[PDB]
Design a protein around this motif. Structure first.
Motif, PDB file in Angstrom:
ATOM      1  N   UNK A  48     -65.265  18.515 -68.788  1.00 48.86           N
ATOM      2  CA  UNK A  48     -64.187  19.479 -68.998  1.00 48.86           C
ATOM      3  C   UNK A  48     -64.439  20.691 -68.113  1.00 48.86           C
ATOM      4  N   UNK A  49     -63.896  20.667 -66.900  1.00 50.12           N
ATOM      5  CA  UNK A  49     -64.067  21.768 -65.959  1.00 50.12           C
ATOM      6  C   UNK A  49     -63.331  23.003 -66.461  1.00 50.12           C
ATOM      7  N   UNK A  50     -64.068  24.061 -66.785  1.00 53.68           N
ATOM      8  CA  UNK A  50     -63.465  25.268 -67.348  1.00 53.68           C
ATOM      9  C   UNK A  50     -63.274  26.294 -66.236  1.00 53.68           C
ATOM     10  N   UNK A  51     -62.222  26.104 -65.453  1.00 54.78           N
ATOM     11  CA  UNK A  51     -61.793  27.078 -64.466  1.00 54.78           C
ATOM     12  C   UNK A  51     -60.506  27.733 -64.943  1.00 54.78           C
TER      13      UNK A  51
END
Lengths: 51, 51
Positions: A48-51
């Motif tokens: 889950x890439x949190x950008x």
């Protein structure tokens, strides 16, 4: 020795079956230990890439 | 000799999001008992599977 196999159950408890009934009938022998061998396996992995 | 008079006006709108926690789930559930005995302090463990 009262616990020949080294496990939490004594020779009499194993030989008479006076233990948990989910324990395999192998381990009713005072020489075979009651022993769980638990492992873990990974099915997949989510990121889950949190950008 | 010049004198300028100005009058501006603006209006902005934005929308941000976090791509790691971009939503929250809320599941409405209900427990069922189909045995012969009652169960006190029922504590289920559930999976939430998607695709």
């Amino acid at each position: 020795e009262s616990n020949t196999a080294g496990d939490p159950y004594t020779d009499y408890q194993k030989a008479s079956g006076s233990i948990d009934k989910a324990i395999k009938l192998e381990a009713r022998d005072p020489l075979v230990a009651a022993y769980p061998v638990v492992g873990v396996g990974m099915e997949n992995l989510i990121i889950s890439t949190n950008e | 000799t010049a004198v300028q008079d100005s009058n501006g006006e603006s209006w902005n709108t934005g929308l941000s999001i976090n791509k790691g926690e971009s939503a929250y789930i809320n599941a409405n559930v209900r427990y069922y008992n189909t045995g012969t005995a009652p169960m006190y302090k029922v504590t289920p463990t559930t999976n939430l599977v998607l695709d």
